[PDB]
Design a protein around this ligand. Structure first.
Ligand SMILES: *[C@@H]1O[C@H](CO)[C@@H](O)[C@H](O)[C@H]1NC(C)=O
Ligand SMILES: Oc1c(F)cc(F)cc1-c1cc[nH]n1
Length: 346
């Protein structure tokens, strides 16, 4: 199990002002650290954040968190479940800021909620340095869904933080799972609000922050563009592996898709567009399945692209950062319909 630690800097808080935190299982014989960002949508005004507080309160507060959590999938310490990184130091960072890990704003006389996602990540890294992270060789920042987008927004800031603190030997890398979204036209078109507009509003409500080079390209008012992987990825310096189902269920939900010719062409076009955005991403795993998230699921070892599993692809990525014979790192399905790959989750 992983053990809960609430942040010692109690000014870095969840939405309701309670302290944020992290769950940790150390591996004394290892110089590898995995920091995983949880997902879970977002909220972008008082009314919809109030509703989330009623029925999704563990995503806005630490008051009810359990003292332990079981590591699963890539966070498992058993080689049978985790062929990739079973011996690493494992960290699970709960998502309690509702801001896609972008916010830097405290609760105050003018703010009912705090949105501190970007500051939570930096404070976890700071406090871990005293618990062994100072001796690391590789820090892999990973995440699923909103946590995958959070990797894209924060991986270069973690790298800069450690450089400025005097640790240039720690190699920071990113693993983004199910957080590579398209700002496409909906199939059919209040919280009717497409993600482009919801994120435009959220950035102001959260005091949201994006990576510097992407900010300089898009400029004031247009920072929402940096929440979309195909736009922010080319600006990043750290190595990032992208895991993305071609027919992601959250993407279909925001597209108002719940089969005749019109919808068939829509779905096929979505898969082709996603494939096109990955054509020049050298480390990626993108199967032709209707699903959502994978890396902390117990059965993450089952899916394969071109005969290669995800744990194998990640191991090949590790070797490439030391092409490899029979050890590929770019794996994108070409068949055009969900479940055309027989290994898709059932
Ligand atoms: C606590 O965190 C805040 C917000 O990131 C920061 O401004 C402050 O310097 C931190 N203080 C300590 C003692 O870590
Ligand atoms: O975080 C997102 C983002 F930045 C852009 C987008 F289109 C969708 C999401 C999303 C959907 C479910 N969780 N997160």
């Amino acid at each position: 199990d992983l053990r809960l630690h609430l942040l010692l800097n109690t000014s870095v808080t969840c939405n309701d002002g309670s302290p944020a935190g992290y769950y940790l299982k150390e591996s004394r014989g290892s110089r590898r650290w995995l920091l995983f960002l949880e997902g879970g949508w977002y909220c972008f005004n008082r009314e919809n954040c109030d509703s989330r507080y009623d029925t999704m309160r563990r995503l806005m507060s630490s008051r009810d968190w359990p003292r332990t959590r079981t590591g699963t999938g890539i966070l498992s310490s058993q080689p049978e479940e985790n062929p990739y990184w079973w011996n690493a130091n494992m960290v699970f960072i709960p998502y309690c800021s509702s801001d896609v890990w972008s916010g830097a704003s405290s609760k105050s006389e003018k703010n009912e909620y705090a949105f501190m996602g970007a500051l939570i990540i930096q404070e976890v890294v700071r406090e871990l340095l005293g618990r062994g992270l100072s001796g690391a060789k590789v820090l892999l920042l990973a995440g699923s869904s909103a946590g995958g987008t959070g990797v894209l927004l924060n991986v270069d800031r973690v790298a800069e933080q450690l450089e400025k603190l005097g640790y240039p030997a720690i190699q920071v890398r990113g693993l983004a799972d199910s957080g590579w979204f398209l700002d496409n036209k909906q199939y059919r078109h209040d919280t009717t609000c497409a993600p482009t507009e919801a994120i435009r509003r959220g950035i102001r409500y959260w005091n949201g922050v994006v990576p510097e080079r992407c900010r300089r390209q898009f400029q004031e008012g247009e920072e929402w563009n940096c929440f979309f992987g195909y736009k922010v990825y080319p600006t990043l310096r750290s190595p990032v592996f992208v895991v993305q189902w071609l027919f992601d269920e959250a993407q279909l939900t925001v597209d108002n898709v719940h089969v005749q010719e019109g919808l068939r062409l829509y779905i096929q076009n979505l898969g082709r567009e996603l494939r096109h955005t990955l054509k020049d991403v050298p480390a990626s795993f993108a199967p032709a399945c209707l699903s959502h998230e994978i890396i902390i699921r117990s059965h993450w070892t089952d899916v394969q692209v071109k005969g290669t599993s995800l744990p194998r692809a990640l191991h090949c990525w590790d070797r490439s950062l030391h092409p490899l014979k029979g050890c590929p790192v770019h794996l994108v399905d070409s068949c055009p319909w969900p479940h055309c790959n027989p290994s898709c989750p059932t």
